[PDB]
Amino acid sequence: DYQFPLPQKNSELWIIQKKTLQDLSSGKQKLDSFQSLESILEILRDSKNQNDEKYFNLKAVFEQLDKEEQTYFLEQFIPKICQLVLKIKKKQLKNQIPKESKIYEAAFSREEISYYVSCMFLCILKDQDRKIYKDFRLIYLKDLVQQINIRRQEKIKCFYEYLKQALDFSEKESKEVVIFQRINCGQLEDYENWVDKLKAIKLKNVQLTDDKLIEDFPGTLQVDFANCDIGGGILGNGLVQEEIRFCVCPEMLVSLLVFDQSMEANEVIIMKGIKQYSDYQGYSNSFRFVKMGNSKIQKQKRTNPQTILAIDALCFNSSDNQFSEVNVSRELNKSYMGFKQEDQLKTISTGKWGCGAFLGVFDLKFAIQWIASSRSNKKMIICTFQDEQTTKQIQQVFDLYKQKNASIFLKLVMDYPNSKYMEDYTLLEYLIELGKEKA
Numbered sequence: 001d002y003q004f005p006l007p008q009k010n011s012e013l014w015i016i017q018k019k020t021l022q023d024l025s026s027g028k029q030k031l032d033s034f035q036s037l038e039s040i041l042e043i044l045r046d047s048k049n050q051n052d053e054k055y056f057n058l059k060a061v062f063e064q065l066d067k068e069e070q071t072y073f074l075e076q077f078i079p080k081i082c083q084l085v086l087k088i089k090k091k092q093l094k095n096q097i098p099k100e101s102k103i104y105e106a107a108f109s110r111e112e113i114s115y116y117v118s119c120m121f122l123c124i125l126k127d128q129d130r131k132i133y134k135d136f137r138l139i140y141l142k143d144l145v146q147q148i149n150i151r152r153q154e155k156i157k158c159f160y161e162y163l164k165q166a167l168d169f170s171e172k173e174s175k176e177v178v179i180f181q182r183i184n185c186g187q188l189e190d191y192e193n194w195v196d197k198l199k200a201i202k203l204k205n206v207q208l209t210d211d212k213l214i215e216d217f218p219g220t221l222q223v224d225f226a227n228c229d230i231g232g233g234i235l236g237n238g239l240v241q242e243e244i245r246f247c248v249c250p251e252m253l254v255s256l257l258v259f260d261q262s263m264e265a266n267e268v269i270i271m272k273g274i275k276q277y278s279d280y281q282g283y284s285n286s287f288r289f290v291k292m293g294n295s296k297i298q299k300q301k302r303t304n305p306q307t308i309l310a311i312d313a314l315c316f317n318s319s320d321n322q323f324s325e326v327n328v329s330r331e332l333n334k335s336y337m338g339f340k341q342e343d344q345l346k347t348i349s350t351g352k353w354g355c356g357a358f359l360g361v362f363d364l365k366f367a368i369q370w371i372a373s374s375r376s377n378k379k380m381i382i383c384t385f386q387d388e389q390t391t392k393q394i395q396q397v398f399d400l401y402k403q404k405n406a407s408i409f410l411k412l413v414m415d416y417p418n419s420k421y422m423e424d425y426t427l428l429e430y431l432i433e434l435g436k437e438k439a
């Protein structure tokens with residue numbers, strides 16, 4: 001049972017750190033410049049050396065602030081977050097791999113979570129014996145590629161926005177519980193086993209949306225298209241679906257602190273009580289932090305906690321056969337083991353799961369999720385992210401196969417690769433051709 005070392009674990013260094021924290025917390029030490037901050041950090045990281053690039057991205061965010069907020073940042077914000085670190089009572093966090101069919105759950109107060117994100121902000125979360133860190137140091141660090149520095153800078157804005165809001169927490173809000181769950185789901189079923197089990201199952205409802213994002217659907221089981229290492233490149237260069245979600249909902253960062261080990265094929269992660277703190281536009285290189293507004297919808301995102309299912313798709317290469325009975329049954333397991341969780345959340349909010357850098361064919365990832373949600377006895381919302389052609393296709397397929405038998409459906413899908421249509425039909429087109437052929 002692995003335990004992630006909090007700063008106090010190293011009492012030697014903790015002496016120095018603590019000294020410096022209350023030093024700033026009190027107003028004893030006052031920061032006049034960003035240069036001052038940098039030496040603060042170098043101390044807290046216990047680092048001999050020091051060049052300017054180490055904090056190039058942090059600096060860049062700092063300098064985009066107005067003179068008033070730069071003042072605020074150095075005189076008020078940093079000291080206040082040092083105080084949050086000082087409120088920490090734990091010296092390590094537990095990373096347990098649940099036994100078969102059991103759950104490792106870890107719960108925190110909303111404020112406690114802010115204490116830990118503060119540690120990440122001040123680059124003091126590391127396991128020296130493993131030479132593993134879990135804070136913002138790479139993000140702060142200058143990269144050779146400007147786009148990458150922008151992504152880092154943008155992530156920094158999100159975490160800062162979040163931190164500012166964590167300081168203004170009402171007594172009530174700071175006590176609310178956030179919950180992380182590593183869930184072992186037991187025996188993996190194989191292809192034949194699946195085909196059998198689905199004979200009893202009918203395809204359930206699916207809704208398409210061109211222009212909405214997953215988090216626009218509060219009160220659903222919201223999917224994070226996760227890496228097997230939860231968080232993916234959140235602490236580095238990553239800025240696609242999973243990392244973006246961590247960016248706008250930074251409480252998720254703590255999952256990094258308890259779920260060190262890769263998810264196993266029969267594992268899923270659930271995060272409850274997660275609120276959204278930033279808005280954004282774009283994706284990857286175009287991703288930009290956008291301060292959250294005042295509208296009805298914005299107030300809700302900020303104040304209404306959501307529940308999130310993190311499941312990791314297979315990472316394919318270009319030669320892999322995604323339609324193999326082994327690969328399919330694997331994705332059926334993962335999604336269904338995930339979707340069947342939180343049975344009071346009867347709608348799954350999902351989308352192009354594993355179809356980006358993971359090279360998944362979306363037509364098939366759709367079919368698998370539909371089968372999984374159906375078996376789960378849940379409705380599904382699919383976000384196609386402005387893919388007009390796919391939207392049209394999936395709609396048609398839904399109209400042809402809703403309420404139809406899921407086992408017949410699966411077999412239909414599994415024959416595509418062999419079928420005649422394999423050459424100049426996509427999977428969805430092939431399904432349409434066979435759905436229209438019935439007349």
Ligand SMILES: O=C(O)CCN1C(=O)/C(=C2/C(=O)N(Cc3c(Cl)cccc3Cl)c3ccc(Cl)cc32)SC1=S
Nearest residue numbers: 225240241242244282283352353354355356385386
């Ligand atoms: O498995 C994955 O990490 C990626 C799944 N995937 C997306 O999430 C895609 C997005 C996308 O094209 N876009 C751009 C986009 C936006 Cl911002 C708004 C409306 C439509 C689109 Cl396409 C995304 C924007 C936000 C989020 Cl969270 C995801 C996407 S494309 C794709 S494949």
